[PDB]
Structures are given as structure tokens and as C-alpha cells.
Amino acid sequence: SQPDPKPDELHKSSKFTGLMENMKVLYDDNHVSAINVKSIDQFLYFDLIYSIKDTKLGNYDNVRVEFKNKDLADKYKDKYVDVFGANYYYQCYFSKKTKRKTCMYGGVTEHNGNQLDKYRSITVRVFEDGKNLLSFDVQTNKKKVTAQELDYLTRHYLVKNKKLYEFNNSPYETGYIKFIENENSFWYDMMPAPGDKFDQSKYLMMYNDNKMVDSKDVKIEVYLTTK
Amino acid sequence: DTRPRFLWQLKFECHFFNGTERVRLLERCIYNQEESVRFDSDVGEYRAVTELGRPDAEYWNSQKDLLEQRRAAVDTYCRHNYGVGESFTVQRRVEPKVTVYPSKTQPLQHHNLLVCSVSGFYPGSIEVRWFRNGQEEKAGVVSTGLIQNGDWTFQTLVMLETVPRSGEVYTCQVEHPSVTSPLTVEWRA
Amino acid sequence: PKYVKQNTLKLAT
């Protein structure tokens, strides 16, 4: 459905003069993960506050979930939901109604109308300069899965094995994650915006729409180019 | 929608007297419509406006480093933001569009209003003078005042009460800082 | 040229 990137549309890693570590931390071992939770508070008309305690490191007590519009916030306002996605700490501001906190965009799927007995595996096809490089499987325990959840799991493997994001830069020039669903398709830019600084909130903002895809009909492919 | 509404307002006013010579910072804490707590650079400390603003003033006056930051804010915040926007806020100059036309279709010997439409200008400082065949006319000057459009432009309608005889020349003089010489638009009866 | 903002203070509790 969405057209493929233009010859100059993709972000180049060579143009980025900052630190790739700020991008790597989002797709590292740490992420917000909660099973069957309801929103305790609300900061603004487009967001929701969930009480999720960090047990792995202990960096957060409350998580802010932002959306593109007011309609998305009122939809998951009372219903018991499943939270998954990459979180940021810098430039994350909100106040709970009467201490350590984190912020994120979308990544919410209803608990009642979902969940699976067996872990569904989705095949990933990684391409280096249009040519096949490697292939791996991504596991999930839900039918309707957010685009953020699948994007995080795919990047986490590529950071650990193929080393997608390093401390200073990346071994690949351009990169984009493609999600194909029967006739409809959509893509997200993997590389950061050009400059000396990387904004975590501005980049993670692409998940505010809360795009969901069915695990049974979803196909995922990664396209990256060398320097 | 019958549910009640609650509003909290915070305003940081930077008052500039004679350019930059005298700077006054005014912090204002407003609940609904009534102002509770305020700070003034001329005072140097937080002073309560209402009874609800009393514990906030005492809490903020106890800490010497909060007050020091607010006192230094006339230079680090007020004087700083003035110089940043100086090229597009203070020094903004837009030439006005002057148009002279009668209010209604009326023949000679009978009264009519001469509309001197002056629109799209910055700043608001303007001097509109009426002339009857070279001589200044101060009587019967109906002005709508200064209207702010919101898009950094101003508009004013200055009307003159006249009784055209035959071939009288009515000139509208417009004085604005954007123009070196005053703009004059003439209308013949 | 950067615009500077004033930090809001928390009320007494």
C-alpha cells in the first residue's frame, strides 16, 4: 500500500555526527513489558499513565503511553491492556495524581480479545545491498501484534548478532524495516536523522498511531546497504 | 457536558521601558480568574495577592537561591529574549495600504463620510491627518481606533464628515515609522 | 539565537 523509499529519501549514517549508542539503547535488552494492565492516571488528553514496575534494573515505577490523537487514548483508557515497546528517559515529562519514570509511544493490544497457547514464529529476510545476507525467526504469544513489538525484536537480534547499532556509528549506510500484510505494506526508517544530536522522543514518535498487524498473515523483510 | 472546569495560569511578563534602559519582570500565578502569587523585580521578593497565595510566598522566600535566579532573570531571561527577537519583533516595519473612498453613493451639496482605509502595518504607532484643499481639518474625525489582526498586522478606519460643493480635493496624510515621507492619497468630489 | 524559558515552581504541600 505504502510506496518504497526514493533514491534520496532514506537517512544516511555518514550524515549523522552524533552517537549511535542513543539509538542502540532503545533496541537493546531493556524494554517496557507488562501483561494485563489498566491505566491508573492520565497526564494529557492524548496520553495514558500505567503503573509498571521495573524488576530487571529498577529504573521506573510509572510508564507514560502517548498517542497521535484523543480517540486512541479514550479507547484504551479503561480496558485491560498489554504494554510492549521501546522507552526513553531524556525529555520525558509528566505528573501522576498525588517517583522514577519513563515515556513511550503506542504499543498497546487488548488482553481479552488476544493471547495464544503456542508462540507464533514470523520469518525475517535480511538483505545487504539488495542481496540476501541472513534469516531468523521472531516469536510472539498474540494474534494482533503492534508494529513496534516486531520492529524491536527484529532490531535486537541484528544488534546482538550482525551489530546494527554501535557506540559511534553503524557499519551500514541506510536501512529500513518492511512489514507486508497480504496486499497492504508499510515501512519505517532505521537510521537516525542528519545532525550532531539524536532525539529519542522525536524518533520513537512514529509509533503514536498504534499500528497493529495479524501474526498469521504478517511477513517481515529488512533492507540495508554497505558504505 | 455539565462537569465543572478548573484553570491554572502562569505568566512571566518582561516590561521594557525606553528600549532596554529599565527592565521589569512580573511573574503571575492565576487560579481560574483570580491572581494568587506574584514576583516583582522592583520588590525583589514573592508577595501574596490573595489568602491562598500566602503559603507559596513564604515557601519561596525561605530559599535564597530561588529568589537569586528570579532577580537575575531580568538579564538572563528578559534582556536575553529581547535581543534574540529584536530583528523581527521591535525592528518589524510594514508599509500600510492607504485607500480613500466615500462611505455611500451620494451627490454634491449633501453630506457623506470619507473612509481612509489604512490596513496591514507594524508597529501600531500611526498618525492619520485629514486635509481639505491643503488646510488641516480637525473637526468631525470619526476613528474606529486601532484593530490588531493577530497576524502581526494592524488596521484602522479614519472617517471625515464633509459636505462636497463641486471640485474639492480631500487628502489623507498617513505618518508611520516605516515611511520617511508621509503617504498622501487624494480624492476629488 | 535561542529563546530562554522560565522554570515553573511547585506549590507548598
Epitope: 542513543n22 528517559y89 | 537575575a72 538572563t76 536575553h80 | -
Partner: T-cell receptor, first 111, second 110 residues
């Protein structure tokens, strides 16, 4: 307070060394500096909060980690031409804004 | 961005008074005053981006418009000996990017 372990470090040319820095002051901002004999403090890398990373003057050849709000270690790679320096870790207050320094670490690298 | 401390070296007697100056090329949001003891431990003296503060025998003043900072040491003690640093956070680029000065070498003669 702020802790820097060990007090003295020694490694040969080519080897990688990780310098530890810990604080229980609950500060978000953490810093890494290096001091040469008779010289001043040169900023390497700094973190404003957990998962945030910023560059400094002498950043090349070094790498930092920030997974938790307590620890911020500095790794010295073989890429650094002159690694022999007195490394100092710092932490800025959230409310007072005061920068507090640790004991420091003396590192010596020889071929 | 550019920090210059004057004097580079200062020799004082026990119980003497002297002022230490720190000059910076740009406008600063945050300023720090340090005292590095002969062993290398940096002792935080003052956080003074503007105004005047007092801490025992030591006093500090900063003028943001004039772009300089002063550090007054009354009744010099033998333990005050070492290097005095002036760290500044420039508004031109980056928040909390503290740049340290050349330093004032103090030798208090007992």
C-alpha cells in the same frame, strides 16, 4: 557519595580497560573527565540521565555505558593514542545543580 | 567555550586575603567553583551562575552580563594550597557541558 574503583590501574598497549563509577546521591547527570600532569580537566563523555549519551572534547578512543541511574563506566580502547591520564568522574545535583567529584583513577599504559 | 583564569600562579602568606578571577568568552547558564587538593580530590566550593554566596572563609560573586566570576579567600590557611578550578556551562551549545579553566595554583606559606 561518589566512588571510583580501583584507585590505580595498569594495562599494556592494545588491552582494553573499564573504569568504574558509582553514586548513591540519586543524581541523573553523570560526567567523565581526564587530567594530565600540570594541565586542566578535559571532558570525555557525559550523560544527562539513563540511556542518554553526549560527546566532549577528547571523546575519540573512549566508550561509555548507562543502563542504570547509579553506574556510568568508562571503557578505554586501543584507539586512544595517549591513555595515560588521571580520570575523574562527576555527578551533578538535580535540585542544587552542584557538580560533585569522585576520588579519581590513575591509569598508565606502556608498550 | 573559552575559559581563562587569572592569576595562573599565586603565592600567599598565612592569614592573607586575595581574590581569584575567572573570565569566559560566552554567556553561561551554570557555573562551578572547585578546589583540587594536593592529592587530586576536587572539593566543590560554590555553584554560582549569578549573585553572591558565602561558605565559611570563602566567598564568591558572578556577573552574567559582565561575563566574569570572582572568588575571595579571607584568612589563608595552609590546607587551602592546591589548584582552583572554574567550570562553566555555555548556553551557545549543549546543556551541562561543563568546560574547566586553566586553573589558579595557590601556595599558602605557613
Amino acid at each position: 557519595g561518589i566512588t571510583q574503583s580501583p584507585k590505580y590501574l595498569f594495562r599494556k598497549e592494545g588491552q582494553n580497560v573499564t573504569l568504574s563509577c558509582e553514586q548513591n546521591l540519586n543524581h541523573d547527570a553523570m560526567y567523565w573527565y581526564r587530567q594530565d600532569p600540570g594541565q586542566g580537566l578535559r571532558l570525555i563523555y557525559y550523560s544527562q540521565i539513563v540511556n542518554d549519551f553526549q560527546k566532549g572534547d577528547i571523546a575519540e578512543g573512549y566508550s561509555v555505558s548507562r543502563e542504570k541511574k547509579e553506574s556510568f563506566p568508562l571503557t578505554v580502547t586501543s584507539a586512544q593514542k595517549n591513555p595515560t591520564a588521571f580520570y575523574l568522574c562527576a555527578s551533578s545535583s538535580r535540585s542544587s545543580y552542584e557538580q560533585y567529584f569522585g576520588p579519581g583513577t590513575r591509569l598508565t599504559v606502556t608498550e | 567555550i573559552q575559559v581563562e583564569q587569572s592569576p595562573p600562579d599565586l603565592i600567599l602568606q598565612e592569614g592573607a586575603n586575595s581574590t581569584l578571577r575567572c573570565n569566559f568568552s560566552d554567556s553561561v547558564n551554570n557555573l562551578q567553583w572547585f578546589h583540587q587538593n594536593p592529592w587530586g580530590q576536587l572539593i566543590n566550593l560554590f555553584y554560582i551562575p549569578s549573585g553572591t554566596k558565602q561558605n565559611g572563609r570563602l566567598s564568591a560573586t558572578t556577573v552574567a552580563t559582565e561575563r566574569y566570576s570572582l572568588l575571595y579567600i579571607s584568612s589563608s590557611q595552609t590546607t587551602d594550597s592546591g589548584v582552583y578550578f572554574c567550570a562553566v556551562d555555555s548556553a551557545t551549545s549543549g546543556t551541562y557541558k561543563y568546560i574547566f579553566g586553566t586553573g589558579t595554583r595557590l601556595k599558602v606559606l605557613a
